[PDB]
């Protein structure tokens, strides 16, 4: 049985969150699009292995749109981490395993480094350390041009699985539609330079498990593989690209449970 | 002005080879398809920066087909390295910079490790260390089914640049046509286990520059990036996939000259 609900935190944000299962806490942090329905079926798979899984739309996105501006503009890993800690403090989640892709990856590494007592282990996927002008330059467009470009780009190029992507349904795509512009203005100039992956030695020996998309062109996250390997951090692949939880839910879910079981 | 000619070596092979320019010796080893016309425009670009560039069709391939069976069956990095040292002995090339992709890559690191006095520096691109069953399984097909599958796969998927690939013209494709089956039977079962990258400390300090294709899916040569980074070996990207010398000749040529200039 899944809890769908809202909870507010004292940084002015009102989160939409979902939660299923009983057991140690596993937290699924979204990618930059901030949309926790992407996790829907995996929240169930993971929970069925004896975990309490929590997830939530991110600030300014989807149903967590009631949030002050600082929370979705000039977004950094360190800002996102403190926001996620706040929603963990409100839900009374003390010790959590965390997953995140893209800005979620940057977020979970910042969580692991900043709050080591709170984080049992962190799985980061495709952490973005580089400025990409093709993304950054969308920010100057008209809102509705941004949605068209970005929606089309997710569907045709980088979903990892276009059928799975489309099957999320009209409601999700209508929420994503509104998110694309806020993401485009808030995230890609300031997320990469916040990457908390420049201090190698802070990573060494930490409970961190890094992945990258198997179908993703080698250039996009080449740097993650170098960095993980220099730091001694476990690094491997998942199928698909940026959204293994949409394209390959079963393998995703299994990966999260297995990795969590390593650290209990 | 370019020399186009043949020379025979005492291991039974008669090589077709081309050679242009004056300067330090740069040697372009083909990928598995064995076809040195892929390097045409680059042989000129590199030479024009003051090098003597040599290239050649590989044994059993294209115009170097007059060769005994051991030279194109159960092919190995160590065999290919022996064969190229022979054609370098016959052409009186004593010190050479070498490039090679795929089986060429394996060949040039075997060359660097086995004949250190002969090799000024080696550039390896996408060195294959894994058995792939989809390639290995083509070997049991009818010759002409192998050509159709592999030619289609190069043109549609994996060329890095489909226009450039097709622009090599009818003669080269009619030679590749005959090579595909020889390659399929000779190379993919035995090249990966010969990968001379299992001794990390043999690679450390060596004059080796490793690249991978930028557009190539991350899974294919994930392992190269790990292995390079563990060995302290310089590792970067080129544009396209397995054939940067076809898809991106200008940036390929510049990369070979620039890297060679680092080691004079
Ligand atoms: C929302 C996803 C979209 C992936 C598109 C994908 O094709 C582009 C992948 C590289 C960029 C990801 C990204 C980079 C940033 O600087 C900040 C981010 O929040 C993201 C990120 O979350 O990317
Ligand atoms: C000729 C290219 C095939 C390109 C398809 C290419 O997309 C196939 C994936 C990479 C494999 C390359 C390869 C693997 C081997 O075990 C032996 C080889 O000689 C090659 C090789 O040279 O690869």
Swiss-Prot record, chains A, B:
Which residues does the annotation say bind zearalenone? 32, 102-103, 183, 187, 220, 242
Q: Which part of the chain is the AB hydrolase-1 domain? A: 27-207
User: According to the UniProt record, what happens if one changes residue 223 to A?
Assistant: Retains about 40% catalytic activity
EC number(s) per entry = 3.1.1.-
Q: Which reaction does it catalyse?
A: zearalenone + H2O = hydrolyzed zearalenone + H(+)
> What is the recorded phenotype of mutating residue 126 to A?
Abolishes the catalytic activity
- pH dependence per the UniProt record: Optimum pH is 9.5.
**Catalytic residues in the record:** 102, 126, 242
A GO biological process of this protein is:
response to toxic substance
InterPro entries tied to this protein: AB_hydrolase, AB_hydrolase_1, AB_hydrolase_fold
Entry keyword Nucleotide-binding? no
Q: Quote the SUPFAM superfamilies the UniProt record gives.
A: alpha/beta-Hydrolases
Keyword Lyase annotated: no
Class in the EC hierarchy, top level: hydrolase
Consequence when changing residue 158 to D: Strongly reduces the catalytic activity
Q: Which residues cross the membrane?
A: none
Q: Which GO terms describe its molecular function?
A: hydrolase activity
Q: Which UniProt keywords apply?
A: Detoxification, Hydrolase
The UniProt family comment states: Belongs to the AB hydrolase superfamily. Hydrolase RutD family.
Q: How does it assemble?
A: Homodimer.
State what this protein does.
Answer: Lactonohydrolase that specifically hydrolyzes and deactivates the mycotoxin zearalenone (ZEN) and its zearalenol (ZOL) derivatives. ZHD101 prefers ZEN to ZOL as its substrate, but ZOL, especially the alpha-form, shows higher estrogenic toxicity than ZEN.
Name this protein carries in UniProt: Zearalenone hydrolase
């Amino acid at each position: 049985m899944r809890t769908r609900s809202t909870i507010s935190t004292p940084n002015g944000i009102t989160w939409y969150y979902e939660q299923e299962g009983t057991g140690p806490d596993v937290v699924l942090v979204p990618d930059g699009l901030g949309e926790c329905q992407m996790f829907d079926s995996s929240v169930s798979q993971i929970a069925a292995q004896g975990f309490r899984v929590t997830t939530f739309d991110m600030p300014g996105m989807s149903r967590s749109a009631k949030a002050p501006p600082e929370t979705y503009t000039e977004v950094t890993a360190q800002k996102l981490a403190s926001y996620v800690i706040s929603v963990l403090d409100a839900l009374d989640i003390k010790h959590a395993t965390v997953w995140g892709c893209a800005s979620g990856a940057s977020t979970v590494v910042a969580l692991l480094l900043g709050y080591p007592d709170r984080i049992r282990n962190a799985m980061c996927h495709e952490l973005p350390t580089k400025l990409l002008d093709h993304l950054s330059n969308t920010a100057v467009l008209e809102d509705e041009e941004i949605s068209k470009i970005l929606a089309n780009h997710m569907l045709n190029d980088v979903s990892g699985g276009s059928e799975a992507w489309q099957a999320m349904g009209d409601e999700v795509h209508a929420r994503l539609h509104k998110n694309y512009p806020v993401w485009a203005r808030g995230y890609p100039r300031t997320i990469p330079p916040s990457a908390p992956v420049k201090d190698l030695e802070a990573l060494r020996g930490k409970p961190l498990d890094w992945t990258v998309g198997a179908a993703t062109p080698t250039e996009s996250f080449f740097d993650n593989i170098v960095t993980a390997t220099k730091a001694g951090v476990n690094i491997g692949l998942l199928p698909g690209m940026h959204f293994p939880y949409v394209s390959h839910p079963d393998v995703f879910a299994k990966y999260v449970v297995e990795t969590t079981q390593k650290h209990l």
